[PDB]
C-alpha cells in the first residue's frame, strides 16, 4: 500500500506507506571463547600427523599473542555521537579485578548466562566456543609426553575446524583495530544471534522484528575486542535496540526548479533541501536528511536516531503549502540550470533545462515521452527507463498508485531582478527577507530622488538678503526704496 | 506533571495472587514504555514486566514468565501487573517505571527515565 | 599519450590524453547453484570420518536455512538513481509461479542457457555448482542406511572443497543484506565472468574492453541474492554495460586563487568549483564532479554515467577564457587564504599563502624550489616531492609533457571593496552580477547623499518673517531700520 | 591525564591531554613470493591423493594466470594528494628491464635484503613465501613425467596450507584492482610486519610506537600488486612513516549557539566551524577538520598530515578570546535553530532550542536534568545518557576532570536587525565587516531622510516676492507697511 | 524529426540473398547504436545485428553469424542488413531500431529507443 | 638562510677515533631530523646516523651500531657524530643533512632537504 504524490509547484514528491524501525538504544552482550593455556609443545616427533599439529598449534598461540598486543543535504545540521560509548564502557568494567572470574564462573555449567557486573549492569554472556575442553581432552593426552601418541589424521582435521573460528575472529580484529562492523558470522553465528535476541530484555514485537531481519541487525551492530585474561577471551558485541516500530514513514525527494527563459544564464532556480526520510515519532517527526543512512526492506525502513533531527510535526506543511506561515521551509537557490532526474519510489522526477534531451521510454515501445523544459514527473506504470542527457535511469517497478498534484512552479512568483540566487543554506523567509531589503532600497531611493528636484536650492552667499519670487532668488533691496 | 503511583501492595500468603495498579498522569503512554520493577531486601533492583504503550507487546523475564502478566486499560490510563502463585522470594518493593520509546534501551532498571515511589509486597505467613 | 596544461590565470590545470569507458546500462544474469534436499542424517556412527562428515554436512544445511531467512565539489548537483532497480526487477520475476521451473528445465542439459522470463526479458543463466549431484552420487551411499559404509579420509577433504564455495557465497550475503559489491570470485569466478561477457549481447569492442579489465568490471557489478526454491539457489549478477568507449577524456584540477596583500584581513579568494573528470559524449560533455567515482587504468578511465552531468561542449571554454560569453564558469569565493597543494596527473599545483613554508624537492638534491605567495605549478620531471606547511606530498611519476600557460591571476581584476566573499555555490556571471549590483547601490546612494547641503530648510516658527542671506535665515526685521 | 574545558560563551569545548602520532611520509617495502613454473600436469592418475593435488595444483595455476591478467566541516579546504604515488613509482621501477633481476639475485640465500633501484632508491626486500622451492623439490616427482610417482595426503594438507596464502593475496587484489587497504594478515603476518619495522631506517622511538600499534600501522598501509615475471610474484607494501610523535593534541567540539526568543522565526544562530583535531607541529599547528580521519588509541592520536591544514599557532586564541585581533576565527551564521548534542571526550554539549525536550539521565536515578533553551554542557561524571528530542546519546565514560567556563553567549552581542544570517563559509571579521556596513548605511540614510524631511517646497509663481513666516510663504508686501515716511 | 524506414523485403528462395535498408533522418548516427530485429508470427521479437555508430563494431547472435552482416554508409546516412544463404526459418518481419549510446543497454528489443515499421521477408520453396 | 657546515675530517689510522661536527644556521633543530651520511668513492651515498631534534631518539644502521654514536648539544646548536674503532672501509666523504619532521620520510639520502658540502675522512 505504497503511494506517491508529486507536487509540480515545488518540484518534489512524497512516497508513503512505509513502516518504521528506528534504533533507539544499545544492548551490550559479552561473547567469550574459553581458551587453553598451552606454553611449550615438547615433542621431537616427525610424524606427519603430529607435524600438522605443531603448525596448527602455532597458529593458535600466534592468534592469542596477536590478540594480546591489541588490548594493551542537511546532514551537516546533525549532532555528533560516540557510537560505541556504551560498549566500550562495558568493556572498561571487564578489566576490573574479579570481573572475569564472575563471568568464567557463571558459564561453568551452561554456555548461556546472565551476569550482573560490578557497576550493576546485567549483561547476557555467551560461551560460543570451548577450545579449552577440546584441547585438554583431545590433544593434551597425546602431547603429554615427549614420546607422542600419534593421533589419527581425522583428529588433526577436527582441530583445524574448531580452531578456524578463532583464527577468523582474530583476523577481523587485526585489520580493524579491535572494532568491526558489520558483525560477521565468525563473531556471532545466526543461531547465536537468534538466541541472543530471544534472551534479550525486549518486547515480543521487537524479538519478532529482530529475528526476521538479522541481516540488518548485523549491519547495525559492533563487535568490540575487549580482553584476554586467565584463559578467557572475551569480546563485547553491541546490538541495536529498536524502540520504535510500525509508525508511519515517508521519503521526500526533491529536484531543482528553474525558470525556462531563452537567454542562457538569465534563469533563476530553487531547490527544496529538506529531502530525506521522515517518521512520525512521539508527537514529533524524526527527520533523516541523509536518506542513504537508512535501509529499506520491502515496506519497512530501518534508520538510526543518531542520524536524525527532531522536528515539529508542522514541517509536513511544506508539502501542502510551502509559503505557510507556521514553518519556514528550507530551500537553496541558484542559477545552475543543469538537467537531472530523481528516481522516486513509484516514478521519476525530471528537471529538464537548456538544450538537454530528456525522455522516458517503455520496454517495447521505446521513447514514449519527451519532456519539455521545466520540472515534470512520470509514474512507473508503463514506463521502464528514463534518460536525461547522457544518463540512463532504470525506474523502480513496485506496484502502487501515483498522484500528480498540479500547480504553478513557485519560481515564477519571483522577480529575477531582486532574487538572491546564491543562497545555499537558505529558507523561504530568508529569501523573502533579502528580497524585501533590495526592494525597500529601490522604492525609497527612487522615492527620494523624486521630490529632491522639488526643493529649492540655496540662495547666493554674498552678504545680501534674498527673497523668493517667480522661482528665483531676488535681492531684497529691489523691493525697497534704498531704505 | 509526570507522576506514577503504585498501589495494591499488602501481605499475601504463598501461592496467593495479587494485582498492582500504576496510574500514569502527566504524559502519554503511546509514546512510552511502562515497566514493573522490584527490589527485594539487600538485593539490586530488577525488571519484572515491560509493555509497549503503542503495540501492547510485552516482556517477562524468565523468573516470573507464566506467573506474572501485565496489562493496560486505555480508558483508565492505568497499567496493571497481575501476580499469580506468589512465592516468598517475590517479597520486594514493586516500582512502576517508564521511558520514552524514542529513548528505549531495554527493560532494565538503568534504562528508565521516571520512577514511582514504590509499593511493598510481602509473601509470608505471620 | 598524456599531456597537461596549467593555467596561471585561474589556478587550475587540465590533464588530457585519456580514453573513456562509461557504464551506460546494466545487464542482468542469473547465477544458480543446484542444491541437495537433505532432511535427517541417518547414522548412529561415532567414527571420526563420519563425524567429520556430519559436522561438515550440518554446515551445508545451516547455510541453506540462513540464505532462506535472507530472501524473506559539485556532486550535490547530481541526480538520484536506484542502482540495482533493474537487477531487483529480474529477481522479482523469478519469484513468480512456474518461473524457477522454466530456469531449472532450461539448464537441464547445459550449464549455459538463454531463458526468456515471463515478461519477455531474455537473460543468460548459469548453473555454476551442482551440490545436488555431489551428495546424491557421493554421500548418499554412506548416509542412507543403518549399516553404514564408512570410507577413508580423502572424501571428508573433498566434501569441504565443493561445499566451500557455497559457504563463502552464503557468508558474503549474510553481512551485506543480500547485495554485494564488488562481485567477488566466490560469486563469480574469473572464467565464469569472462564467458558471461563472451556470451553477452554486446559488440566486440565491448567484449574486448571488459575481458581485458575484469577487475574493474567486478567493482562496477552487483550480486543480488534472489531466491531459494525447489533445490535451486539463485542470485542475480548485475553487470555494467559500456556503451561509450575510446572517447577523449580530461581531468580538471583546481586550487584556491587568492590575492597576496600584506594585511591579512585584506585578501580575497576565488576557486573554480568545476573540477572533476570530463568526457566527450554524443555531442555533449559528460562531467563527473566526484572524480573518486572514476577509476583510472593507464590512460583508460572508467566512469558511471549515473555520476555525471551532461553539459554543452562550450563548457570547455572555461579553460581558455574564463570570462567567455558562451558558458558561465562555476566558482567559489572566500577570504580564507590557507595553503595547500593539488597533485595533478603530471605535476603539482601549489597554493601558498601567508607565512607558510612551501617547497619542492628532488630525490638526490633536496629542496630545489621555494614557492612565493600565490598560485604556482611544477611538472613532475625532476621533482619528486612537494611540502606545504607540515604536509608532504609525493608527486606522480608518470611520463608526459606539461605546458605552463602564463596569464595574470584573475583575482587581481577585482576590487576587494565590492567583491562578494561569502559565495559558496557561485559562478562568474553571478559574481559579476552582484558587483554590478553593489556598484549600482553606491552610485545611486552617493547621488542621494550629495543632496544634503544644497536645499533650504524651514525657517523658525516664531511668528516672524525671515529672508535668506549667506546660507541661513535672517529676520526681515533686521533690514527695515 | 585527560582534561576538558567547556566554553559557554561560544558553545564549544576543547578536550586536551592527547599525544600525537602523525604519518608524515611513506616507506615502500617489496614483498615477494617465489613461484614455481609449472606448465602441464602430466598424469594418467585416478588416485584420490593425486586427484586432490590436481584440483589444488589447478588453483595454484589459476591464481598465477589471474594475477598476470591483473597487471596487463572545513575538509573542503584541504588539498588533494596521490596516496600511492610513492609505491607506484617504486613499482614502475620494478618494470624496467633488468630491475627484477637485481632483486631476484639478492634474495637467494637470505629472505631479507636491501636493494638499490636504478633511480637510486634503496628498498627493503622480503621473501615471505617460496612456492618455487616447494613444488620443484616436493611434488615435482609426480608431475613432470607422464608416468606419475604418486603422492600422499599429509603432504597434500601441507600443500593446501602453503598454497592458500597465494590464493588469498590474489583474491584480495582481484576485488580491489590490485591495491588494498588496510593491509591484511594474508598480505603480511604480524611477525613479518614486526621484523619489517625493526629493520626499517627509522629511530628507536618510532620503532616502539609502530610495534605497540601494529593494528593502526596496517590501516594506514597499502598493498600494491606490482609484477609477475620470471617466477617471481612481487607486490609493493607502502608503510606509514610517523615523523611527528608526542606533541600535544586537542579536539575541538562545537555546536550551534542561538538566541532564545519565543517566536520560532525570530532567532539567530552562530556556530564555530573550526572543529576537528589540533596538534602542535614544528612551530605551527596541524589542523584536521574531519576528526573521523583520525584514530584514537587511549591518549595517543593517529592522524595523516595528508588530511590537515597548517595554521599559525595563534589559531588557539579562538578558544580563549573569539574576538581576538590576531586570528580571524571561522564561524557560520543561520536562522536554523534545531536541537542537537555533541558528545565530547568527557561530557556532552547540548544545544536545546525551540520546543524540544532535552534531558540527561543517570543509570540508577533516571532523568536528573532538563536543559533549558540555549547552549549548555554536562560532564560525564554522574551522567550516563543524554536525550535530545527523539535521539538518545550514550556519553563517553573515560576518567578526567572537566571545567565549565562561564560567559555570556556571544550571539547576544549581535543586533538581529543587521545580522547576516545566510553566511555559510564565514568568520568573525567577515561578519563584523558586514555589520559595520549595515550600520554605516543606517547612519547615512537616517542623516539623509532627516535633512530631506527638513526642506521646504517652492513658493508661488506669480509676480510677487515671498518671505518665510510660520512655516508658510508670505507676501513680502505684507511687512513693508510703514517705510513711508 | 526522427524516423526510420526499412525497405528491401520480399520473397526469397532458400540459399538466396537479400539486402535491407534503413534510412535515418532527424539525428546523427555517430551518437547511436543501430540494430536489426525480427519477429516471426506468434513468436517473440529477437535481435539479429547491432553496430556502433561511432566505431562500427558489430554484434551477431550465434544463429545468424556468418550468414548475416550489417554495414553502414555515412555518406548516404543508411544502415544495411545483408542476408546470405537464407533459410525458411528466417521468414519474419525485420525491424530497424536504434538507441543513443549514452543510454546503451545491450542489443535487446527492450533496449531500443526508436523503431521502424518493419518489412516482411519470406523464405519459401 | 639555511646552511650546514661539517668539520673534523682528516687522515686517520685504522682503529683510531674521530669526531665530526655539523653547525646549523638558519633554522631550529627542534623541528627537524638531523642525519649523518657518507659516500665512499665510486659508491652510492648511504645513511649513517639519525637523531630526533625533539626527543633525542637515535637510529644507527647495523654496520656502525655500537661503534658510532650521535649526540646533540642544544646550547651550541651543533650535532656530533662520534666514531670509535674506525675501519678503512669507512673511508668516505661524510655529509651532514637535515629534514623537517613534518616532511620526515626516513633516514634515507633521498629523504633529506638540506645538505652540507661535506668533509673528507680517510682511514
Ligand atoms: C516582506 O515584505 C512584505 C510587504 O511587502 C511583507 O508582507 C512580508 O511579511 C515581508 N517578509 C519578510 C520575511 O520580511
Ligand atoms: C555588468 O555591467 C557592465 C556595465 O557596467 C555590463 O557591460 C556587463 O554586461 C554587466 N555584467 C553583468 C553580469 O551584469
Ligand atoms: C567596525 O567598526 C568599528 C568602529 O566603527 C571598528 O572599531 C572595527 O574595527 C570595525 N571592524 C571591521 C571588521 O570593519
Amino acid at each position: 500500500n505504497i503511494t506517491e504524490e508529486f507536487y509540480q509547484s515545488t518540484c518534489s514528491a512524497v512516497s508513503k506507506g512505509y513502516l518504521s524501525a528506528l534504533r533507539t538504544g544499545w544492548y551490550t552482550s559479552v561473547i567469550t571463547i574459553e581458551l587453553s593455556n598451552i606454553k611449550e609443545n615438547k615433542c621431537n616427533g616427525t610424524d606427519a600427523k603430529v607435524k600438522l599439529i605443531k603448525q596448527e598449534l602455532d597458529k593458535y598461540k600466534n592468534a592469542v599473542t596477536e590478540l594480546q598486543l591489541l588490548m594493551q543535504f542537511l546532514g551537516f545540521l546533525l549532532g555528533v555521537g560516540s557510537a560505541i560509548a556504551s560498549g566500550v564502557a562495558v568493556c572498561k568494567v571487564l578489566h576490573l579485578e574479579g570481573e572475569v572470574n564472575k563471568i568464567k564462573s557463571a558459564l561453568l555449567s551452561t554456555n548461556k548466562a546472565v551476569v550482573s557486573l560490578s557497576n550493576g549492569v546485567s549483561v547476557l554472556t555467551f560461551k560460543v566456543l570451548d577450545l579449552k575442553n577440546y584441547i585438554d581432552k583431545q590433544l593434551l593426552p597425546i602431547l603429554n609426553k615427549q614420546s607422542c601418541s600419534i593421533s589419527n589424521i581425522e583428529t588433526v582435521i577436527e582441530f583445524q575446524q574448531k580452531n578456524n573460528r578463532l583464527l577468523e575472529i582474530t583476523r577481523e580484529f587485526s585489520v580493524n583495530a579491535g572494532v568491526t562492523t558489520p558483525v560477521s558470522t565468525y563473531m556471532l553465528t545466526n543461531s547465536e544471534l537468534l538466541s541472543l535476541i530471544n534472551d534479550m530484555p525486549i518486547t515480543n514485537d521487537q524479538k519478532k522484528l529482530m529475528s526476521n531481519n538479522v541481516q540488518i541487525v548485523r549491519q547495525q551492530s559492533y563487535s568490540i575486542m575487549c580482553i584476554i585474561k586467565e584463559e578467557v577471551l572475551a569480546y563485547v558485541v553491541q546490538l541495536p535496540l529498536y524502540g520504535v516500530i510500525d509508525t508511519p514513514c515517508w521519503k521526500l525527494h526533491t529536484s531543482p526548479l528553474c525558470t525556462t527563459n531563452t537567454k542562457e544564464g538569465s534563469n533563476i532556480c530553487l531547490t527544496r533541501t529538506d529531502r530525506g526520510w521522515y517518521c512520525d515519532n512521539a508527537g514529533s517527526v524524526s527527520f533523516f536528511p541523509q536518506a542513504e543512512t537508512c535501509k529499506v526492506q520491502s515496506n519497512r525502513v530501518f534508520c538510526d536516531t543518531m542520524n536524525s533531527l527532531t522536528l515539529p510535526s508542522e514541517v509536513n506543511l511544506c508539502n501542502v503549502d510551502i509559503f505557510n506561515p507556521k514553518y519556514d521551509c528550507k530551500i537553496m537557490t541558484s542559477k545552475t540550470d543543469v538537467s537531472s532526474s530523481v528516481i522516486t519510489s513509484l516514478g521519476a522526477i525530471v528537471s529538464c533545462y537548456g538544450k538537454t534531451k530528456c525522455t522516458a521510454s517503455n520496454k517495447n515501445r521505446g521513447i514514449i515521452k519527451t519532456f519539455s523544459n521545466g520540472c515534470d514527473y512520470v509514474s512507473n506504470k508503463g514506463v521502464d527507463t528514463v534518460s536525461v542527457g547522457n544518463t540512463l535511469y532504470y525506474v523502480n517497478k513496485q506496484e502502487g498508485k501515483s498522484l500528480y498534484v498540479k500547480g504553478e512552479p513557485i519560481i515564477n512568483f519571483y522577480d529575477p531582478l531582486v532574487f538572491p540566487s546564491d543562497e545555499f543554506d537558505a529558507s523561504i523567509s530568508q529569501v523573502n527577507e533579502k528580497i524585501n531589503q533590495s526592494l525597500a532600497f529601490i522604492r525609497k531611493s527612487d522615492e527620494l530622488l523624486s521630490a529632491i528636484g522639488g526643493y529649492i536650492p540655496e540662495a547666493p552667499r554674498d552678504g545680501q538678503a534674498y527673497v523668493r519670487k517667480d522661482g528665483e532668488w531676488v535681492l531684497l533691496s529691489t523691493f525697497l526704496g534704498g531704505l | 506533571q509526570v507522576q506514577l503511583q503504585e498501589s495494591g501492595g499488602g501481605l499475601v500468603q504463598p501461592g496467593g495472587s495479587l494485582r498492582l495498579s500504576c496510574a500514569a498522569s502527566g504524559f502519554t503512554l503511546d509514546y512510552y514504555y511502562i515497566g514493573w520493577f522490584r527490589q527485594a531486601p539487600g538485593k539490586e533492583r530488577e525488571a519484572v514486566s515491560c509493555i509497549s504503550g503503542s503495540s501492547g507487546s510485552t516482556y517477562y523475564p524468565d523468573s516470573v514468565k507464566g506467573r506474572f502478566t501485565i496489562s493496560r486499560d486505555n480508558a483508565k490510563n492505568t497499567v496493571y501487573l497481575q501476580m499469580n502463585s506468589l512465592k516468598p522470594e517475590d517479597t520486594a518493593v514493586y516500582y512502576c517505571a517508564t521511558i520514552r520509546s524514542s529513548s528505549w534501551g531495554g527493560c532494565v532498571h538503568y534504562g528508565m527515565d521516571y520512577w514511582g515511589k514504590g509499593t511493598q509486597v510481602t509473601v509470608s505467613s505471620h
Side-chain angles (χ1 to χ4, degrees), chain A residues 183-223:
Chain A
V183 170
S184 72
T185 50
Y186 287 122
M187 296 294 171
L188 230 43
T189 71
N190 265 62
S191 196
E192 285 162 358
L193 182 50
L194 282 174
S195 284
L196 247 186
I197 292 164
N198 183 42
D199 288 7
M200 217 157 290
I202 51 184
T203 50
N204 299 328
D205 63 10
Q206 279 173 63
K207 285 181 188 176
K208 184 150 184 58
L209 176 81
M210 292 175 78
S211 303
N212 291 332
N213 299 94
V214 296
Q215 70 279 358
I216 304 302
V217 170
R218 291 185 181 283
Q219 286 185 326
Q220 301 199 281
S221 298
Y222 291 88
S223 184

Side-chain angles (χ1 to χ4, degrees), chain A residues 194-448:
Chain A
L194 282 174
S195 284
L196 247 186
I197 292 164
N198 183 42
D199 288 7
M200 217 157 290
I202 51 184
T203 50
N204 299 328
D205 63 10
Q206 279 173 63
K207 285 181 188 176
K208 184 150 184 58
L209 176 81
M210 292 175 78
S211 303
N212 291 332
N213 299 94
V214 296
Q215 70 279 358
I216 304 302
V217 170
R218 291 185 181 283
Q219 286 185 326
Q220 301 199 281
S221 298
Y222 291 88
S223 184
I224 306 154
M225 180 55 181
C226 179
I227 35 178
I228 291 193
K229 182 150 180 165
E230 307 176 328
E231 305 168 24
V232 175
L233 151 48
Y235 48 98
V236 170
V237 168
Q238 189 180 280
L239 294 153
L241 284 187
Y242 302 87
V244 178
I245 299 176
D246 291 332
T247 65
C249 291
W250 59 100
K251 188 177 182 182
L252 174 56
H253 317 75
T254 71
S255 199
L257 178 64
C258 309
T259 52
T260 57
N261 298 323
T262 302
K263 310 273 187 184
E264 182 243 30
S266 86
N267 292 316
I268 51 171
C269 307
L270 200 65
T271 312
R272 298 187 54 195
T273 46
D274 53 358
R275 60 192 193 250
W277 274 104
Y278 291 78
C279 290
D280 287 325
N281 182 359
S284 294
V285 168
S286 287
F287 164 59
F288 311 86
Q290 313 305 133
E292 330 80 46
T293 61
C294 297
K295 298 147 205 66
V296 185
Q297 302 270 278
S298 65
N299 68 8
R300 174 87 60 192
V301 177
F302 291 82
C303 299
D304 191 315
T305 65
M306 185 54 64
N307 311 311
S308 70
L309 295 180
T310 306
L311 298 185
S313 67
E314 288 77 13
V315 67
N316 187 269
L317 292 170
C318 300
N319 296 315
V320 171
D321 180 15
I322 200 167
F323 298 114
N324 82 85
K326 301 191 172 191
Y327 190 88
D328 189 21
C329 302
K330 292 198 56 61
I331 55 168
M332 73 163 299
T333 66
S334 82
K335 277 192 166 169
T336 313
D337 52 339
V338 184
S339 298
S340 63
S341 175
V342 168
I343 300 303
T344 63
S345 296
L346 291 183
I349 301 171
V350 169
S351 299
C352 193
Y353 304 114
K355 297 180 184 293
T356 309
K357 176 171 185 196
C358 312
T359 57
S361 296
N362 179 281
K363 53 170 55 92
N364 311 307
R365 270 193 239 97
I367 291 171
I368 57 180
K369 187 183 173 68
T370 298
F371 296 97
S372 304
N373 281 271
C375 178
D376 202 354
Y377 170 86
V378 66
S379 85
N380 64 348
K381 177 187 174 180
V383 177
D384 294 312
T385 63
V386 154
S387 291
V388 180
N390 300 329
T391 305
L392 176 77
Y393 303 98
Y394 283 83
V395 75
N396 296 112
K397 292 263 113 186
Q398 192 189 1
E399 170 59 35
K401 297 173 293 174
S402 294
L403 175 58
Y404 193 112
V405 182
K406 310 193 212 181
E408 206 187 359
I410 60 168
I411 193 68
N412 296 342
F413 299 148
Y414 295 86
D415 173 21
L417 309 191
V418 296
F419 187 70
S421 43
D422 50 333
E423 309 275 339
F424 183 77
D425 187 29
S427 67
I428 292 300
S429 76
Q430 289 181 305
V431 168
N432 284 346
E433 195 173 345
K434 283 202 175 184
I435 293 174
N436 271 338
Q437 287 187 30
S438 289
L439 282 171
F441 167 85
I442 295 182
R443 295 171 225 162
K444 294 177 174 295
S445 77
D446 287 344
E447 284 176 7
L448 260 52

